[PDB]
């Protein structure tokens, strides 16, 4: 029954029963579950033995082992929680101790025996009958948990920082498909005026940290954007429920994380007096026994709303299928190191003077923030690099390394804390660019810095126009962030987009007279006076085209694939910069019964407004390739044919991918989300070949749009509300300024 | 200009101005094309022509729905006709000649006046009378006697009636679109049979009809200025042959009835809810007005009840009562039906008060706990959470309609309710409390059914119903998105 599967999940899984196989046979374990007196007898003899070794520290060892058993079952967090027996053996945060106070293995047995007594009486009765009538089934299930435990222990024992911080008795659990629970600030949430969230409680916090009023908000079943929920979306390996190397938690949800040195020392001596609150803070311990961070826990009662599943058979399959995926991503990083060594070998062989353009990564690092991230690098990749190069050797090209660190000149904040945003200088540069490219009216309704979009529309017809301008705006802004991340300087784009817009603008105007001068040539079959005038006119225009800076793109044909496919008078608005008014003109051609349906109106693929959006989208790609081509030629020193080779592999023709969704459904915003997804896959595949150093760095050095979920409550980006059809946001302030991640291997698989 | 990937050629605006001279038509009607050219060039009308294979290959590359007319019987004859796309103002021609190109310019322009008149817009006073005169003739067109006419004339009349009556008797298409299409087909029949009826025919009732409609179009085309005398050729045997493409918004009943029988493991497979949703359609959804819904602020009295009831539906699911996507939609639709009825009849919820008060006397927190003697503090918290909502503490008036709606959809609450004792006053009926609550729900909706089935305009409830149809439309499109998002055998996002 479904109740028996849940009892087995709590008994075998959450109590870490696999640790008993070190000293007891499989038949003896089945005897413990069938007799409560045996459990009480084992505790009595185990307590006496540990008391002799512990000595005067017996009171503290007993207290901390009982507190841990409370968390593993009922989820309660006490004061100064120690997550495993390795930390309890050293009594971190209680007394200064130079080693294990007692036997680590003995303490492990006592902790899991204590938590076995905390289980429900009805729950224990179910396990007793199964252990007697299903002998062959129960033994096989126990053996699976032994295999799951060894893999985690193999990764955890590699580093001492993650050895003292991994959770004991961790087993995955999944929420209900569709629901969402977040913790948000009260004042910031009020101004959004969202109509899908309900406040279900308040966040009290602890007395050691002072902050603004917070609360819990819950969202019932709905439809969410793809690749935003249901997966961990983490680019780092996890052992024991925490990140390998740092010790930060990723298998659960926390309200925040504090890592700054001056602030952490402020919390430390405030909790020495005492702690009070429903949500105490959990510390993170160093290798020497100090404290390096703090975390904000979550009330266990608020997790009941998520309707979590605890099916033992299903969650083991999720556990093993996730360990395999982590192993494959680990092996991929080893092959990249082999390629980096092969390139370094040839250059030195050709000439001994080529070593002047290489930097030792594992050696001394001058940059402090860069150096700290290097130390916490995964230990499995460190040994592989040392195997090929030598003792503390990792040489990479200096020019390729500078590109991978071009993000830090424009971003501020810390990724782990969760407050990494663009610098105010960067925003004032991007904001002025969108106003010039798009219409002035469009800027007022899209990037309003005080009000959301839904608060600025008060007519049923204006909803259709507003929902159409969003799609080109998202594509225009997404490309700017993506090219900024890849090392292109900010000041280059700021001075080149107006230059390229002007060059493109005069192209259609000049092409307009040439596109119909052939009609006059057909009517010029006669006296040479008509021919003489036409011949000079057409040749003069073409000579002007030859001198344009974007000419090489024109000859390739990709720059004029759709320019010559159709000429209309209203399309001059797009080239001028009146996109918002260009949408109104095509909106009035809709039927009266459709225009007045507002957000309920279904737009067909045959209408003129539908094809107007597609024309504008390819007009944004008009400028994207122009900037990239200059970058690969001016500051990269590449041939005019090499640059055009790379451009063709990062853009696709959208006429081959019509929507394939149901009728009677608003699939306008969902179709463009999937189209933009495929183009991101091609970009990631190109970055691997043309920049092996950047791909390896992206999973080592924290950076915005480089790491996925960090354990904090799920946050959206610009690409998320586009697919969901919402309007309670704006692309100019707060949320909505975030861009999707750029990790190459992450995008290929997720 | 010719397409690169196909032999199709494209003609845009301001490219056929000289074509007025090429046709060498009489000068009296030659100036007409100069005015027709200006009108079509103002709204960016482009012409695409080619061979049947070339024009078919172009559509596939650009994802264009074609409406070429040809059959195996017509293949032996060997004639192909194009179509016009009224949505994006594009004309498609197949193997055109000089006559057919001119005939389409005066045909597309004429249909614009018909569309504008039937959309509620304003037209020229001369055009208004011409369309009205044509409309009156169509009424008598479908009431003639063809027993005295030639056998070849009867076939032409038979085809016209069948297509004309189809547009008039259509319920799932916007009436404004259907009305214009029916009139356009009427003109085509008259122009097609002008040649064969002017000769070798008698003065029958049908014959006079052909002559009258021909003159009716003449006034519409030429406007208030002088037209050519009677019996004169229009444009060298003018004909209407291209088909039109038109689209509009679907009705509320179309999308609400589509997802009634949805069922899946990831979506919900409760059979009792699907049957409950079927009886809702008979009483409420069937009697909504057939016109497509709109989006207005709708400030009133019932509109306050629907906004309040929407918030309580969300608040219930956030305070202990989790629901699937199938249960959520039925909960929203049924509650909004009782909410609008209580805002019109103050005594609609008189019976539900007796059943609600009786239930509150025999309810305890222990009824919501699977294990009455659990040790985990979180188990007791969730049970107390559900008790408060039933007690109304969490929700903190339209509170009664929400409880009546919840008592019909939730399956865990119904198990608790059915075990309560029955009052001695209601022991005569012989029903449990759960069935008494579900029988009271249909009584409220049945009273609302009679309200919508009467004289809505005189009762001054037309605006209130327009508010109820918007809520049903919104909830129908939401369950169309969760569905198709789990359209896999595993039902995973």
Using H for helix, E for strand and C for coil, what is the string for A212-226?
CCEEEEEECCCCCCC
Structure tokens at B360: 């509150």
Structure tokens at A559: 């720059």
Chain A residues with beta carbon closer than 8 angstroms to that of B19 = none
Q: Where are the beta strands (DSSP E) in A161-316?
A: 180-185, 198-203, 214-219, 238-239, 242-243, 256-258, 281-285, 291-296
* Residue pair A509/A485 in contact by the 8 Å Cβ criterion: no
Determine the Cα–Cα distance for residues B341 and B347; give it in Å rounded to an integer: 10
Q: At what angle do helices A668-690 and A460-485 cross, to 10 degrees?
A: 10
Chain A touched by B5 (CB under 8 Å): no
Determine the Cα–Cα distance for residues B493 and A222; give it in Å rounded to an integer: 12
| Segments in B284-376 forming alpha helices (H) | 302-317, 325-342, 350-359
Chain B touched by A363 (CB under 8 Å): no
Structure tokens at B171: 């319920």
Q: Would the CB atoms of B493 and A567 count as touching at under 8 Å?
A: no
Which residue in A628, A502, A463, A467 sits closest to A558, CA to CA? Answer: A628
User: What chain A residue is nearest to B480 in terms of C-alpha separation?
Assistant: A665
Structure tokens at B275: 């049957």
Task: Encode B17-33: b = buried (16+ Cβ within 10 Å), e = exposed.
Answer: eeebeebebeeebeebb
Please, which residues have CB within 8 angstroms of residue A38's CB and are 6 or more apart in sequence?
A31, A32
Instruction: Give me the residues of B, 384-443, that contact A with CB < 8 A.
Output: none
CB-nearest to A198 from B12, B314, B328 is B314
User: What chain A residue is nearest to B84 in terms of C-alpha separation?
Assistant: A606
Q: Would the CB atoms of B323 and A221 count as touching at under 8 Å?
A: yes
Determine the Cα–Cα distance for residues B412 and B492; give it in Å rounded to an integer: 26
Dihedral of the alpha carbons of A5, A10, A15, A20, in degrees to the nearest 10:
-20
Chain B residues with beta carbon closer than 8 angstroms to that of A567 = 12
Q: Which helix (H) or strand (E) holds A162?
A: helix A160-163
> 3-class SS at A673?
helix
Determine the Cα–Cα distance for residues A405 and A398; give it in Å rounded to an integer: 11
Residue with tokens 């709204």: B43
Burial grade of B34 (CB within 10 A; 0-12, 13-18, 19 or more) = exposed
Chain B touched by A602 (CB under 8 Å): yes
Chain B touched by A2 (CB under 8 Å): no
Which residue in A393, A378, A373, A368 sits closest to A332, CA to CA? Answer: A378
CB-nearest to A570 from B44, B258, B295 is B44
Sign (positive or negative) of CA dihedral B368, B374, B377, B378: negative
Residue with tokens 């695409």: B48
Instruction: Give me the residues of B, 463-492, that contact A with CB < 8 A.
Output: 473-474, 477-478, 480-486, 492
Distances (CA, A) of A40 to A116, A370, A426: 10, 53, 65
Structure tokens at A736: 């909505």
Q: Would the CB atoms of B378 and A591 count as touching at under 8 Å?
A: no
CB-nearest to B174 from A222, A593, A602 is A593
Q: Where are the beta strands (DSSP E) in A137-197?
A: 180-185
Determine the Cα–Cα distance for residues B36 and B329; give it in Å rounded to an integer: 53
Structural Rg of chain B based on CA atoms: 32
* Residue pair B154/B146 in contact by the 8 Å Cβ criterion: yes
Taking the alpha carbons at both ends of chain B, their separation in whole angstroms is: 47
How many residues make up chain A in this entry? 750
Residue with tokens 């009424």: B139
> 3-class SS at A199?
strand
Burial grade of A58 (CB within 10 A; 0-12, 13-18, 19 or more) = middle
Q: Would the CB atoms of A224 and B493 count as touching at under 8 Å?
A: yes
Distances (CA, A) of B142 to A721, B111, B274, B278: 54, 22, 44, 39
Chain B residues with beta carbon closer than 8 angstroms to that of A564 = 1
* Residue pair A629/A643 in contact by the 8 Å Cβ criterion: yes
Structure tokens at A35: 């007799």
Chain A residues with beta carbon closer than 8 angstroms to that of B180 = none
Residue numbers after which chain A is interrupted (C to N above 2.5 A) read: none
Instruction: Give me the residues of A, 522-541, that contact B with CB < 8 A.
Output: 523
Which residue in A720, A712, A711 sits closest to A738, CA to CA? Answer: A720
Q: How many CB atoms lie within 10 A of CB B272?
A: 13
User: What chain B residue is nearest to A557 in terms of C-alpha separation?
Assistant: B4
Which residue in A221, A223, A99, A238 sits closest to A155, CA to CA? Answer: A238
> 3-class SS at A716?
coil
Taking the alpha carbons at both ends of chain A, their separation in whole angstroms is: 35
Determine the Cα–Cα distance for residues B267 and B326; give it in Å rounded to an integer: 6
Sign (positive or negative) of CA dihedral A516, A519, A525, A530: negative
Q: At what angle do helices B399-409 and B411-418 cross, to 10 degrees?
A: 90
Interface test with B, best of A223, A300, A599, A610 (most B CBs within 10 A): A223
Chain A residues with beta carbon closer than 8 angstroms to that of B373 = 121
Q: DSSP assignment, residue B418?
A: H
Which residue in A730, A467, A499, A713 sits closest to A609, CA to CA? Answer: A467
3-class secondary structure for B264-280?
Answer: ECCCECCHHHHHHHHHH
Chain B touched by A23 (CB under 8 Å): no
* Residue pair A81/A284 in contact by the 8 Å Cβ criterion: no
Chain B residues with beta carbon closer than 8 angstroms to that of A457 = none
User: What chain A residue is nearest to B325 in terms of C-alpha separation?
Assistant: A221
Distances (CA, A) of A320 to A42, A152, A172, A325, B373: 32, 11, 11, 9, 35
Chain B touched by A120 (CB under 8 Å): yes
Instruction: Give me the residues of B, 304-343, that contact A with CB < 8 A.
Output: 314-315, 317-319, 322-325, 328
Structure tokens at A70: 């409370």
Q: Would the CB atoms of A665 and B484 count as touching at under 8 Å?
A: yes
> 3-class SS at B257?
coil
Give the distance from residue B350's alpha carbon to the nearest chain A alpha carbon, in angstroms: 31
Structure tokens at A659: 């929507």
3-class secondary structure for A335-392?
Answer: HHHHHHHHHHHHHHHHCHHHHHHEEECCCCCCCHHHHHHHHCCCHHHHHHHHHHCCCC
Q: How many CB atoms lie within 10 A of CB B245?
A: 17
Task: Encode A662-686: b = buried (16+ Cβ within 10 Å), e = exposed.
Answer: eeebbbbbbbbbebbeebbeebbee
Q: DSSP assignment, residue B429?
A: T
Determine the Cα–Cα distance for residues B93 and B46; give it in Å rounded to an integer: 11
> 3-class SS at B441?
helix
Chain B touched by A656 (CB under 8 Å): no
Q: Would the CB atoms of B88 and A607 count as touching at under 8 Å?
A: yes
Q: Would the CB atoms of B63 and A655 count as touching at under 8 Å?
A: yes
Which residue in A223, A126, A307 sits closest to B412, CA to CA? Answer: A307
Determine the Cα–Cα distance for residues A678 and B263; give it in Å rounded to an integer: 31
Burial grade of A505 (CB within 10 A; 0-12, 13-18, 19 or more) = middle
* Residue pair B267/B486 in contact by the 8 Å Cβ criterion: yes
Residue with tokens 């002088």: B226
Chain B touched by A182 (CB under 8 Å): no
Structure tokens at B170: 């259509």
Which residue in A176, A171, A177, A164 sits closest to A144, CA to CA? Answer: A171
Chain A touched by B177 (CB under 8 Å): yes
Cα B426 to chain center, whole Å?
46
Structure tokens at B128: 């208004």
**Per-position DSSP letters for B136-174, written without gaps between them:** HHHHHHTT---TTS-HHHHHHHHHHHHHHHHHHT-SSS-
Determine the Cα–Cα distance for residues B229 and B215; give it in Å rounded to an integer: 10
Which residue in A468, A193, A599 sits closest to B296, CA to CA? Answer: A599
Determine the Cα–Cα distance for residues B114 and A572; give it in Å rounded to an integer: 30
Q: DSSP assignment, residue A603?
A: P
**Per-position DSSP letters for A72-120, written without gaps between them:** HHH----SS---SHHHHHHTTTTS--SS-SS-HHHHHHHHHHHHHTTS-
Which residues on neighbouring strands pair with residue A182, listed in sequence order? A217
* Residue pair A629/A554 in contact by the 8 Å Cβ criterion: no
Interface test with B, best of A6, A592, A668, A670 (most B CBs within 10 A): A592
Determine the Cα–Cα distance for residues B303 and B311; give it in Å rounded to an integer: 13
Chain B residues with beta carbon closer than 8 angstroms to that of A558 = none
| Segments in B343-455 forming alpha helices (H) | 350-359, 377-391, 399-409, 411-418, 433-452
User: What is the arrangement of strands in the sheet containing A291-296, beginning at the earlier edge strand?
Assistant: A256-258, A291-296, A281-285
* Residue pair A657/A675 in contact by the 8 Å Cβ criterion: yes
Give the distance from residue A607's alpha carbon to the nearest chain B alpha carbon, in angstroms: 5
Residue with tokens 């309609």: B401
> 3-class SS at A524?
coil
* Residue pair B352/B438 in contact by the 8 Å Cβ criterion: no
CB-nearest to A221 from B14, B324, B484 is B324
Q: What angle do CA A44, A45, A49 make, to 5 degrees?
A: 120
Chain A residues with beta carbon closer than 8 angstroms to that of B295 = 460, 463, 596-600
> 3-class SS at B50?
strand
Structure tokens at A260: 């700054």
Please, which residues have CB within 8 angstroms of residue A611's CB and are 6 or more apart in sequence?
B88
> 3-class SS at B346?
coil
Determine the Cα–Cα distance for residues A417 and B424; give it in Å rounded to an integer: 65
* Residue pair A69/A80 in contact by the 8 Å Cβ criterion: no
Cα B1 to chain center, whole Å?
39
Instruction: Give me the residues of B, 8-27, that contact A with CB < 8 A.
Output: 10, 12-15, 18
Q: Would the CB atoms of B485 and A223 count as touching at under 8 Å?
A: yes
Which residues on neighbouring strands pair with residue A203, listed in sequence order? A214
Determine the Cα–Cα distance for residues A518 and A514; give it in Å rounded to an integer: 7
Which residue in B37, B35, B1 sits closest to B19, CA to CA? Answer: B37
Determine the Cα–Cα distance for residues A165 and B147; give it in Å rounded to an integer: 98
Please, which residues have CB within 8 angstroms of residue A69's CB and are 6 or more apart in sequence?
A111, A114, A115, A118
Q: At what angle do helices B325-342 and B302-317 cross, to 10 degrees?
A: 150
Backbone angles phi, psi at A737, to 5 degrees: -90, 0
Please, which residues have CB within 8 angstroms of residue A339's CB and are 6 or more apart in sequence?
A692
Sign (positive or negative) of CA dihedral A178, A184, A186, A190: negative
Determine the Cα–Cα distance for residues B474 and B467; give it in Å rounded to an integer: 11
Q: At what angle do helices A312-350 and A379-388 cross, to 10 degrees?
A: 30
**Per-position DSSP letters for A305-317, written without gaps between them:** GG--B--HHHHHH
Structure tokens at A55: 């000595």
Chain A residues with beta carbon closer than 8 angstroms to that of B376 = 73-74, 120
Which residue in A642, A645, A674 sits closest to A660, CA to CA? Answer: A674
Determine the Cα–Cα distance for residues B100 and B108; give it in Å rounded to an integer: 12
Structural Rg of chain A based on CA atoms: 31
Give the distance from residue A458's alpha carbon to the nearest chain B alpha carbon, in angstroms: 9
Structure tokens at B19: 């074509």
Determine the Cα–Cα distance for residues B61 and B8; give it in Å rounded to an integer: 12
Determine the Cα–Cα distance for residues B305 and B292; give it in Å rounded to an integer: 23
Determine the Cα–Cα distance for residues A167 and A299; give it in Å rounded to an integer: 18
> 3-class SS at B9?
strand
Determine the Cα–Cα distance for residues A165 and A69; give it in Å rounded to an integer: 16
């Amino acid at each position: 029954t479904d109740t028996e599967w849940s009892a087995m999940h709590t008994g075998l899984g959450k109590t870490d029963l696999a640790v008993l196989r070190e000293t007891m046979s499989m038949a003896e374990i089945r005897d413990l579950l069938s007799s409560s007196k045996k459990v009480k007898d084992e505790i009595s003899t185990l307590e006496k033995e540990i008391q002799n070794q512990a000595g005067r520290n017996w009171n503290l060892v007993q207290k901390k082992s009982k507190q841990l058993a409370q968390y593993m079952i009922m989820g309660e967090v006490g004061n100064n929680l120690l997550r495993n027996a390795h930390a309890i053996s050293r009594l971190l945060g209680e007394r200064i101790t130079n080693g294990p106070v007692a036997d680590v293995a003995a303490i492990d047995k006592l902790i899991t025996l204590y938590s076995l007594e905390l289980m429900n009486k009805s729950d224990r009765d179910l396990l007793s009958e199964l252990a007697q009538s299903e002998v062959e089934g129960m033994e096989f299930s126990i053996a699976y948990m032994v295999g799951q435990r060894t893999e985690e222990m193999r990764k955890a024992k590699g580093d001492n920082r993650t050895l003292l911080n991994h959770f004991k008795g961790y087993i995955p659990v999944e929420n209900q498909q569709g629901v969402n629970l977040i913790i948000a600030d009260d004042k910031e949430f009020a101004k959004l005026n969202s109509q899908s969230f309900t406040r279900i409680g308040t966040y009290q916090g602890s007395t050691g940290f002072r902050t603004g009023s917070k609360g819990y908000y819950f969202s019932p079943v709905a439809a969410r954007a793809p690749y935003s929920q249901g997966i961990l979306q983490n680019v780092r390996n996890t052992a024991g429920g925490v990140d390998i190397g740092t010790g930060f938690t990723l298998g659960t949800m926390v309200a925040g994380r504090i890592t700054d040195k001056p602030t952490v020392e402020r919390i430390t001596k405030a909790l020495a007096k005492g702690e009070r609150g429903r949500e105490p803070l959990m510390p993170i311990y160093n290798s020497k026994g100090q404290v390096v961070a703090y975390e904000q826990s979550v009330d266990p009662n608020m997790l009941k709303h998520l309707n979590q599943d605890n099916h033992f058979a299903k969650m083991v399959g999720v556990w093993r299928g996730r360990q395999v995926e982590e192993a494959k991503a680990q092996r991929f990083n080893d092959i990249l190191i082999e390629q980096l060594h092969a390139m370094y070998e040839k250059d030195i062989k050709d000439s001994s003077a080529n070593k002047s353009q290489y930097v030792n990564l594992l050696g001394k690092i001058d940059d402090p923030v860069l150096a700290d991230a290097i130390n916490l690098m995964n230990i499995e990749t460190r040994h592989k690099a040392e195997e090929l190069f030598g003792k503390d050797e990792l040489w990479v090209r200096r020019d390729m390394l500078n590109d991978a660190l071009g993000y830090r000149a424009a971003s501020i904040g810390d990724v782990w804390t969760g407050n990494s945003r663009w610098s105010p200088s960067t925003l004032d540069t991007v904001k002025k660019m969108f106003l010039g490219a798009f219409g002035n009216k469009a800027y007022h309704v899209v990037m309003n810095a005080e009000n959301t979009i839904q608060n600025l529309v008060k007519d049923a017809k204006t909803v259709i126009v507003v929902k159409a301008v969003v799609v080109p705006a998202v594509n225009f802004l997404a490309n700017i962030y993506q090219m900024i991340g890849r090392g292109v300087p900010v000041k280059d784009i700021a001075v080149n987009i107006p230059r390229k817009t002007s060059e493109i603008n005069q192209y259609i105007k000049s092409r307009l007279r040439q596109i119909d001068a052939e009609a006059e040539l057909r009517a010029a079959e006669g006296n040479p006076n008509l021919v003489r005038k036409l011949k000079t006119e057409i040749q003069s225009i073409t000579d002007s085209h030859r001198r344009m800076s974007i000419w090489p793109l024109i000859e390739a044909g990709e720059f004029s694939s759709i320019a010559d496919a159709g000429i209309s008078r209203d399309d001059l608005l797009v080239a001028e910069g009146k996109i918002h008014e260009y949408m109104e003109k095509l909106a009035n051609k809709l039927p009266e019964k459709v225009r007045n349906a507002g957000r309920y109106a279904l737009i067909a693929k045959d209408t003129a407004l539908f094809q107007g959006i597609q024309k504008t989208v390819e007009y944004s790609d008009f400028i994207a390739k122009a900037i990239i081509y200059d970058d690969l030629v001016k500051r990269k020193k590449k041939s005019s044919s090499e640059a055009l080779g790379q451009v063709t592999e990062e853009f696709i023709n959208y006429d081959r991918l019509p929507g394939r969704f149901r009728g009677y459904m608003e699939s306008m915003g969902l179709m463009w989300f999937y189209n933009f997804k495929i183009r991101s896959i091609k970009v990631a595949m190109s970055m691997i070949r043309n920049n092996p150093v950047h791909s390896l760095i992206a999973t080592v050095v924290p950076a915005p749009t480089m790491f996925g979920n960090v354990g904090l409550p799920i946050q959206d980006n610009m690409l998320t509300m586009l697919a969901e059809g919402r309007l309670d946001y704006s692309l100019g302030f707060g949320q909505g300024l975030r861009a999707p991640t750029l990790n190459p291997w992450f995008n290929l698989t997720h | 200009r010719e397409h690169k990937a196909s032999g199709v050629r494209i003609l845009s605006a301001t490219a056929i101005r000289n074509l007025a001279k090429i046709s060498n038509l009489p000068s009296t009607q030659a100036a007409t094309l100069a005015e027709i050219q200006k009108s079509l060039a103002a709204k960016d009308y482009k012409i695409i022509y080619g061979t049947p294979t070339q024009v078919a290959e172009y559509a596939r590359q650009k994802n264009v729905t074609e409406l070429t007319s040809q059959e195996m019987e017509e293949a032996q004859a060997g004639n192909i006709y194009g179509w016009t796309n009224f949505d994006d103002k594009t004309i498609y021609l197949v193997s055109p000649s000089m006559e057919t190109l001119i005939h389409e310019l005066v045909h597309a322009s004429t249909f614009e006046e018909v569309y504008s008149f039937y959309q509620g817009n304003e037209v020229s006073p001369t055009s208004k009378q011409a369309i009205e005169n044509l409309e009156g003739l169509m009424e008598q067109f479908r009431s003639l006697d063809i027993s005295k006419d030639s056998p070849e004339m009867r076939e032409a009349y038979a085809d016209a009636i069948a297509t004309i009556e189809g547009h008039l008797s259509n319920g799932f298409v916007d009436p404004a679109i259907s009305k214009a299409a029916a009139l356009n087909e009427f003109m085509a029949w008259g122009l097609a049979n002008r040649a064969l009826a002017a000769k070798q025919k008698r003065t029958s009732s049908l014959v006079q009809m052909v002559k009258d409609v021909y003159q009716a179009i003449k006034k519409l085309i030429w406007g208030r200025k002088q037209a050519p005398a009677l019996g004169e050729d229009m444009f060298s045997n003018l004909l209407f042959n291209s088909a039109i493409l038109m689209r509009s918004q679907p009705t509320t009943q179309a999308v609400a009835k589509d997802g009634t029988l949805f069922h899946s493991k990831a979506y919900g497979n409760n059979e009792r809810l699907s049957q409950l949703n079927q009886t809702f359609d008979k009483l409420v959804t069937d009697y909504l007005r057939t016109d497509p819904v709109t989006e207005v602020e709708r400030r009133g009295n019932v509109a306050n009840a629907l906004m309040s009831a929407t918030r309580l539906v969300r608040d219930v699911q956030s305070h202990g009562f989790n629901m699937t996507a199938q249960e959520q939609s039925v909960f929203q639709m049924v509650t909004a039906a009782l909410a609008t009825e209580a805002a019109i009849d103050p005594h609609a919820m008189a019976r539900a008060q007796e059943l609600y008060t009786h239930v509150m006397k025999h309810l305890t927190v222990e009824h919501f706990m699977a294990d009455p003697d659990s040790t985990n503090p979180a188990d007791r918290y969730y049970a107390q959470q559900k008790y408060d909502t039933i007690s109304g503490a969490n929700l903190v008036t339209s509170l009664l309609p929400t409880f009546l709606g919840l008592a019909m959809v939730n399956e865990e609450l119904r198990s608790i309710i059915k075990e309560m004792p029955v009052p001695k006053a209601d022991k005569k009926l012989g029903n449990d409390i759960d069935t008494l609550l579900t029988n009271a729900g249909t009584q409220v909706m049945e009273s609302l059914n009679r309200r919508m089935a009467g004289d809505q305009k005189a009762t001054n409830v037309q605006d209130s119903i327009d508010a109820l149809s918007e809520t049903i439309m919104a909830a129908a499109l939401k369950r169309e998105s969760f569905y198709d998002a789990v359209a896999t055998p595993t039902g995973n996002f």
